[PDB]
Paper text:
rkbPAP incubated with fluoride crystallized in a different space group and with different unit cell parameters compared to the sulfate complex. Two dimers in the asymmetric unit are observed yielding four copies of the active site. In these structures the metal ions are on average 3.5 Å apart, a distance significantly larger than that observed in any of the other rkbPAP structures. A small sphere of electron density is observed between the two metal ions, in a position similar, but not identical, to that of the μ-hydroxo in the rkbPAP-sulfate complex. The center of the bridging electron density in the rkbPAP-F structure is 2.5 Å and 2.1 Å from Fe(III) and Zn(II), respectively. Thus, the bridging ligand is shifted 0.2 Å closer to the Zn(II) and 0.4 Å further away from the Fe(III); its distance to the carbonyl oxygen of His323 is 3.6 Å, compared to 3.1 Å observed in the rkbPAP-SO4 structure. These differences indicate that fluoride rather than μ-hydroxide acts as the bridging ligand, as anticipated from kinetic and spectroscopic data collected for PAPs from pig, human and red kidney bean, and other binuclear metallohydrolases. Additional electron densities in the second coordination sphere, close to the fluoride, are tentatively assigned to a sodium ion and a sulfate ion (see Methods section). The sodium ion may offset the charge of the metal bridging fluoride group, and possibly prevents cations (i.e. sulfate, acetate) from binding to the second coordination sphere. However, for the M1 site in the fluoride bound structure the metal ion is shifted by up to 0.4 Å when compared to rkbPAP-SO4 and rkbPAP-PO4 which then results in compensatory rotations of the side chains of Tyr167 and His325. Here, the comparison between the sulfate- and fluoride-bound rkbPAP structures corroborates this mechanism for the activation of the bridging nucleophile.
Purple acid phosphatases belong to the family of binuclear metallohydrolases and are involved in a multitude of biological functions, ranging from bacterial killing and bone metabolism in animals to phosphate uptake in plants. Plant PAPs are 110 kDa homodimers, containing Fe(III)-Zn(II) or Fe(III)-Mn(II) centers, and a recombinant isoform from sweet potato has been shown to contain a di-iron center. The characteristic purple color is due to a charge transfer transition between a tyrosine side-chain and the Fe(III). In this study the structures of the rkbPAP-sulfate and rkbPAP-fluoride complexes were determined, providing insight into what we propose are two crucial steps in its catalytic mechanism, (i) the pre-catalytic stage, and (ii) the chemical step.
Numbering used by the authors:
A (entry chain A), B (entry chain B): 9 to 432
Amino acid sequence: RDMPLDSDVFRVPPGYNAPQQVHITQGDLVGRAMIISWVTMDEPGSSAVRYWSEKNGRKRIAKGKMSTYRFFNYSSGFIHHTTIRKLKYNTKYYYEVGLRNTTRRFSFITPPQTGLDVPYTFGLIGDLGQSFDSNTTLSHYELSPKKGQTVLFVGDLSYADRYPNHDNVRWDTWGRFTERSVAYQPWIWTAGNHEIEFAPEINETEPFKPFSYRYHVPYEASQSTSPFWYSIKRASAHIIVLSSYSAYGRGTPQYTWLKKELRKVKRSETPWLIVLMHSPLYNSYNHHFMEGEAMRTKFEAWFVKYKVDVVFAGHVHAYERSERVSNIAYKITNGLCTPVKDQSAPVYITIGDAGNYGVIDSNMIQPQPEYSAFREASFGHGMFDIKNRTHAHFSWNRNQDGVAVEADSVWFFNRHWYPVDDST
Amino acid sequence: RDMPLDSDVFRVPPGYNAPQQVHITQGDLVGRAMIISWVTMDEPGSSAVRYWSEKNGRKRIAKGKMSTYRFFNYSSGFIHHTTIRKLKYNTKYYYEVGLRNTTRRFSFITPPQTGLDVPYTFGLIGDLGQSFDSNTTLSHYELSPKKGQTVLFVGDLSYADRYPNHDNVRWDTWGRFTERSVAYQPWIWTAGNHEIEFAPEINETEPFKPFSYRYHVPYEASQSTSPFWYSIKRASAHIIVLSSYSAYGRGTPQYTWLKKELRKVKRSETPWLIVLMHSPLYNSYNHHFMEGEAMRTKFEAWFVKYKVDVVFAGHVHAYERSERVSNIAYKITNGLCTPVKDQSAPVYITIGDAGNYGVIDSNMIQPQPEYSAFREASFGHGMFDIKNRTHAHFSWNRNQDGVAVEADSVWFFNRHWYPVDDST
Ligand SMILES: *[C@@H]1O[C@H](CO)[C@@H](O)[C@H](O)[C@H]1NC(C)=O
Ligand SMILES: *[C@@H]1O[C@H](CO)[C@@H](O)[C@H](O)[C@H]1NC(C)=O
Ligand SMILES: *[C@@H]1O[C@H](CO)[C@@H](O)[C@H](O)[C@H]1NC(C)=O
Ligand SMILES: *[C@@H]1O[C@H](CO)[C@@H](O)[C@H](O)[C@H]1NC(C)=O
Ligand SMILES: *[C@@H]1O[C@H](CO)[C@@H](O)[C@H](O)[C@H]1NC(C)=O
Ligand SMILES: *[C@@H]1O[C@H](CO)[C@@H](O)[C@H](O)[C@H]1NC(C)=O
Ligand SMILES: *[C@H]1O[C@H](CO)[C@@H](O)[C@H](O)[C@H]1NC(C)=O
Ligand SMILES: *[C@H]1O[C@H](CO)[C@@H](O)[C@H](O)[C@H]1NC(C)=O
Ligand SMILES: [F-]
Ligand SMILES: [F-]
Ligand SMILES: [Fe+3]
Ligand SMILES: [Fe+3]
Ligand code: NA
Ligand code: NA
Ligand code: NA
Ligand code: NA
Ligand code: NA
Ligand code: NA
Ligand SMILES: [Zn+2]
Ligand SMILES: [Zn+2]
C-alpha cells in the first residue's frame, strides 16, 4: 500500500542543488523563533535562510548548520538546520532557502503571543507513514474546514524501518511528501517506535539516529537535555512532549525533567495543558494492549494532580477517546485496580490512524470497557480547536468521509478554568 | 556517619605513582578472562599488566587502555582497564600493576569451567557506600566461614553524589576502601540510582558518567550494546544484569536484548538463572514502595516463563525475601491484581542493606503482605552458595551478629532440575 517511488508526492524539485524535504517547527519556548530544515542532494550548499515579514519587508539572513549521516550502505544528503529568532507575534513571514544556487520560497505565520484567552487550532496526526491512506489523511488535514495552524505529531513518521536495511531513501521520500504542509506550518515532533531504529544485525545501535538528524526540536528552550522530551508554549497551550522509548524510571533525566516541568506550568498564561507521547496509557485495542502500563504507573498520578486537559498518543492504528478516569489507587494488595471516573483526570485520545503502511487495527478488546468512551477502526486525523480559556472543541475526521465531516466531536471543558463535566 | 577522609581504609598506597583503587571483574562470557582496573594519581603510567599462573610460573603481559574524565571542577587521576584473556580454569593467578614505576602485586582464582554440578559461592552486597556500617558489612563478608568467590553488587556504590558537586574524591576513597576485596575476587557490577549522577545545574548531563569510567563490564560478550545491562556465565550460574534507570520500554535496546538473552539461556549447561537489578519488583517497605512496578509490568512474565531461580535487588536499605509469587494475570478490568503463589516464579530478594551512608529503612507496609516471606531492617550482606544443579543455599548475615551467624537461611531448589515447593 506504500506509494511507489515515482509517485507525484515524492517528486524531486527542479534546479541544481534545489532544496527539498523542507520543514519547520517552533524554535523557542514562546513562539518567536522557528527552526528551518531542508536537504540538498547535489552539494553542501549554504545553510543561510533569507526572511522578512509581509509588512516590515526588511530582508534579513540567518546562518544555520549543515550535517550528514550514514546508516547501512546508505549515505544521506546534506541536512540543514537554521533557527530564525526574535520574530514578531502573529505576523506572516517569507523565507527562502538555497541561496547559493536554486532558491525556493515558502512562508509561515508566527503564532499570537501566549495568553489566557488566545484561540488556536491544532492538528493531530499520528503514525502517518507514506501509503495511499497516508496521502488521503494529510490531504484531509489541509482541506479541513477549520484552518489548522500547527500539527501535533504523536510519533511514527516515515516507516522506513520496515524496508530492507531500513532503506533511508524512504526517509527522503517522506520529507518531500509532507513538505506541502510542514514547510508552511510547524509540526511538533514526538518520537515513536518506528524512529528508534535499533538494528544490531547491521551494526546500527544508536537509537533514533536517522530521525534525530532529520528532525530537530528546541529542547534546550525548556531546559531539557534531550530532544526526545521537551516543552513549548504556543498561543494558549502548554504542550509537553514525552518519549515512550526513553528511560523513565525515577531519577532518570526524562523523569526528573517532567517533574520539574509540571511545576513550572502556569495555567494563568497557558490554560490548556496538553501532553504528547507515542504509546497510549489507555488503550482498549488488542494491538499493543497494555504496552502503556509501565509509563502509566510512573506519570498517571502526576497528570491527575496537575489536571492535564488531554493526552494524545498514537501507536495503535486506530482511534479511541477515553472517559476522564484514573487508576492511581493501587497498592499491590488493596485490590483497587479498576479505572474509576475522575473529573480531575485528562481525557486520553489515541489517533495513530493516519495511515502507516496501509493497515488498520480493528481487533478490539471485548466488550468495550467502561473507561472507553468512543473507539473506531478507521483511518483519519484529529483537530483540537481552542476557543478560549474555557472551551476547546476536539473533532475526529475519517478518510472515508468529506474533509468537513466529523464522525466524532466533543467539547473539552478546561480542567483549571471550567471544572464542568464534559463527558459524552 | 560516613568515614572521615583520614580513615585507615582510605589510606593511599606508598611509592611514586603507586596503583590504587585496584579492582577486577569477569572479562568474558565464560570466565577465561578478567578485567583489571586501577588508578594512578601522580602520572599516566603504563596500562600493562603482568600475570602468571601459580603452577605455570610463566610471566606474560597484557596491554590495556588509559582514560580520564572531569565532572564539575573535579579532574580525575589516570584510569586503567586491561583485559587478561585465554586463562585456564580453576587456577590461581598472580598479577602486577604499575610496572613503569611503583609496582603492586595481587592474585585471583579463575572460576572452574561452566558445568551442571559445579559448586560456587556468590556473595551479595547492595548499596554499600562508605560509612562505618559499610566497613562492618565488608568485614563480615571477608570473615565469612563460607568463603565468597565472587561478589554480585546490586547497585549504589560510593554515594559520592551526596556530596557537594558530587565531590568525585569520594569515588577515589571508595575505590581504595573496597580494594582489599575487589582486587582479589571479581565483583559483578549493577548500576543503581546513585550512579546516575544527572546534575544539569553544573552541566553534567551524561548519565552514569563517573561510574562508567571507573568500572567496566564485558557487555559485548553477551552481544549487549550498553554496559548497563549484560550477561555472564560463571561456574554453574547464568547471570543477567539489568539497568533500572535505562529505557526498558518495548522495542528499546535493553528490552530487545533481554528478550533474546533469555532465549539463549541453557539450563542444561548453567542450571542457576540469576537476575540482578537495582530497584526491587517486590518490596513491602515504605521507602521506594512500588518504584519497581514499571519494570515489573515489562519483565515479570518473562522471569516466570523462563523460570528464573532468583532475582536480587537493592535500593531499599533493608532486607527482604519473598515467596515465589507472580502478579501477571492483570488485564485492567478483570480485577486480577493480587500476587499469587507461583512455583514457576523466582524468589525476590532485597539486599540493599550493606550500609550506604549509615541509614536504615525500618518503616514498612503493615501488616506484612502474604507475598513477603521474611523482612528485617538491619545492615548486612547475603550469600548464595550453589551446591549442585539441584540445590543452592542462601543466607543473610546481619552486622550485629557474629560473622558466621545466619539470621535467615533458605535452601533454593532449582526451578529446572529440582522443582519442589521451597516455601517458608
Ligand atoms: C544496500 O544493499 C542492498 C542489498 O543488500 C542493495 O540493493 C542497495 O542498493 C544497497 N545500498 C546502496 C545504495 O548501496
Ligand atoms: C552553486 O553554489 C555554490 C555555492 O558555493 C557555488 O560554489 C557554485 O558555483 C554554484 N554552482 C553553479 C556554478 O551554478
Ligand atoms: C496525493 O494527494 C494529493 C492531494 O489530494 C494529490 O494531488 C496527489 O495526486 C496524491 N498522490 C497520490 C500518489 O495519490
Ligand atoms: C468560549 O467559547 C465558547 C464558544 O465555543 C462559548 O460558548 C463560551 O461562552 C466561551 N467562554 C468564555 C470564557 O468566554
Ligand atoms: C570545587 O568547587 C567548590 C565550589 O563549588 C570549591 O569549594 C572546591 O574547593 C573546589 N575544588 C576543586 C577541585 O577545585
Ligand atoms: C615512571 O614511569 C613512566 C612510565 O614509563 C616513565 O615515563 C617515567 O620516566 C618513570 N619515572 C620514574 C620516577 O620512575
Ligand atoms: C573497619 O575495617 C576493618 C574491620 O575489621 C578495620 O581493620 C578498620 O580499622 C576499620 N576501619 C574503620 C575506619 O572503621
Ligand atoms: C546434591 O546435594 C543435595 C544435598 O546434599 C542432595 O539432596 C541432592 O540430591 C544432590 N543433587 C545432586 C544432583 O547430586
Ligand atoms: F506502531
Ligand atoms: F538507594
Ligand atoms: Fe505506527
Ligand atoms: Fe542505596
Ligand atoms: Na506491530
Ligand atoms: Na505487536
Ligand atoms: Na508498531
Ligand atoms: Na524517597
Ligand atoms: Na530518599
Ligand atoms: Na535513593
Ligand atoms: Zn508505534
Ligand atoms: Zn538505590
